[PDB]
Every structure is written in C-alpha cells, then in structure tokens.
Amino acid sequence: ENLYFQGDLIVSMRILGKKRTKTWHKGTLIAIQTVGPGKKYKVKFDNKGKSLLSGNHIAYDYHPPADKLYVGSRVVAKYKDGNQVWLYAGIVAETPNVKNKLRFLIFFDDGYASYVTQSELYPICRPLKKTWEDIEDISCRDFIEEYVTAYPNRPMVLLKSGQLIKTEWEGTWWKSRVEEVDGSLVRILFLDDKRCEWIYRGSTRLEPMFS
Numbered sequence: 001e002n003l004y005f006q007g008d009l010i011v012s013m014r015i016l017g018k019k020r021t022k023t024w025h026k027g028t029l030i031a032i033q034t035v036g037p038g039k040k041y042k043v044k045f046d047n048k049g050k051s052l053l054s055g056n057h058i059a060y061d062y063h064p065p066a067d068k069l070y071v072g073s074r075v076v077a078k079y080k081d082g083n084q085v086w087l088y089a090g091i092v093a094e095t096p097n098v099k100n101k102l103r104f105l106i107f108f109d110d111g112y113a114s115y116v117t118q119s120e121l122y123p124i125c126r127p128l129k130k131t132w133e134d135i136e137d138i139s140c141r142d143f144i145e146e147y148v149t150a151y152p153n154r155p156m157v158l159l160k161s162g163q164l165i166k167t168e169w170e171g172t173w174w175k176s177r178v179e180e181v182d183g184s185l186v187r188i189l190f191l192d193d194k195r196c197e198w199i200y201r202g203s204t205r206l207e208p209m210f211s
C-alpha cells in the first residue's frame with residue numbers, strides 16, 4: 001500500500017538518506033510503501049537522484065535531545081576525512097560525563113572512533129532491534145555487539161604519553177608510541193611511518209588488550 005503517515009514520519013518531510021557511497025545527504029521523503037510487514041521510504045536527494053531505502057537508512061535532519069540517546073543508539077555523525085567532513089553512520093559508545101568533558105563517543109561503521117558534540121549528531125529513523133546488525137564489516141559488528149551488551153563492563157589499557165607499545169595495522173604488529181590520551185581514546189604514533197591514529201583504549205589493535 002502507499003501511505004502518507006507512518007509513526008512520526010510524513011510524506012514531504014526533509015530528511016537525510018544513505019547513498020551507495022555510504023555517506024548521508026539531504027533529501028525529501030516523497031513516498032512510503034508497505035509490502036506486508038515490511039516498509040520502504042522513497043527519497044529524492046537535493047540533486048534529483050532518487051533511492052528506495054529501508055527505515056534504518058534514513059535519519060531525521062535535527063539534533064536529538066540527550067535523554068533520547070543511549071549506549072547503542074544508531075546515529076549519523078560528522079566524520080573527519082583528512083581536510084574534508086562527511087556524514088557517516090555509527091553507534092553511541094559513551095554519553096556526556098565529567099571524565100569525557102561532556103561529549104558523545106561515536107564508534108563509526110568502519111571502526112574509526114571520535115568524540116563529538118550534540119550539534120554533530122542525527123538520529124536514524126527506524127533502527128534495528130539489535131542496532132549493530134546493519135554494520136557490514138564483520139570485525140567491527142562483532143566488536144560493537146560485545147561492547148554494547150557488556151556495558152558498563154569495559155576493559156581498557158591505562159596508557160601514558162611516551163609509553164612504547166605494539167599497535168596492529170593491516171594484519172601485523174608495529175612499533176608505536178603513545179602521544180596523547182583524551183578520555184577513552186589514545187593518539188598512537190607509528191614510529192616507521194611517522195603518522196598518528198586515534199584508537200579506543202579497549203581496542204584489540206593495542207597489543208596489551210590483544211593479550
């Protein structure tokens with residue numbers, strides 16, 4: 001059947017939709033379709049290209065209030081790519097507290113982690129029951145499932161600037177050094193390449209967590 005209303009969604013609403021590039025973009029909800037128990041959402045992007053999307057692949061174009069966000073909430077967030085910024089899907093790992101200077105910790109679908117503000121987040125419209133089950137990468141999906149279900153039990157390595165450790169990259173161990181700590185994240189310098197990466201302190205990419 002063709003609907004005009006479905007829960008709190010209304011045909012003609014402005015919304016965000018997931019493109020095949022896996023980045024999210026502004027569009028208009030132009031149709032809502034049912035096939036038995038299933039729903040699909042037709043989005044016209046602001047370039048006139050159109051997609052028929054599942055409800056876990058559309059997001060509201062507004063910033064969610066803090067009492068609506070939990071550990072495990074499915075969101076779209078501002079993602080830093082060199083000198084460019086995109087909107088990319090993730091999971092809420094931490095809500096604002098004194099130890100994280102009142103920020104949200106996001107685990108992105110590709111395994112990147114970063115702290116963001118409330119003005120950098122958007123809520124996905126119809127998340128799955130198990131919110132991690134639409135993460136495509138098996139290693140990221142399994143890690144997120146274990147993290148969200150074990151919370152608040154969170155094993156982490158206590159690290160200090162200057163400490164020498166081994167860090168995983170492309171399947172092998174690399175000589176590295178702790179450059180900085182920010183809450184649950186550590187900035188690692190890869191010593192041979194002389195470039196840095198922010199990594200979650202409970203990641204198995206840090207040799208002390210692997211062991």
Ligand SMILES: c1cnc(Oc2ccc(-c3cc[nH]n3)cc2)nc1
Binds near residue numbers: 127128129130
């Ligand atoms: C495939 C999986 N999930 C959905 O939507 C659901 C969303 C939430 C729940 C639920 C039940 C108890 N708590 N949350 C169930 C279903 N649709 C397709």
Ligand SMILES: c1cnc(Oc2ccc(-c3cc[nH]n3)cc2)nc1
Binds near residue numbers: 139144205
């Ligand atoms: C926050 C941090 N990490 C993830 O996912 C991953 C975790 C571990 C690996 C990995 C690769 C080789 N060894 N461990 C990859 C991805 N997701 C949220």
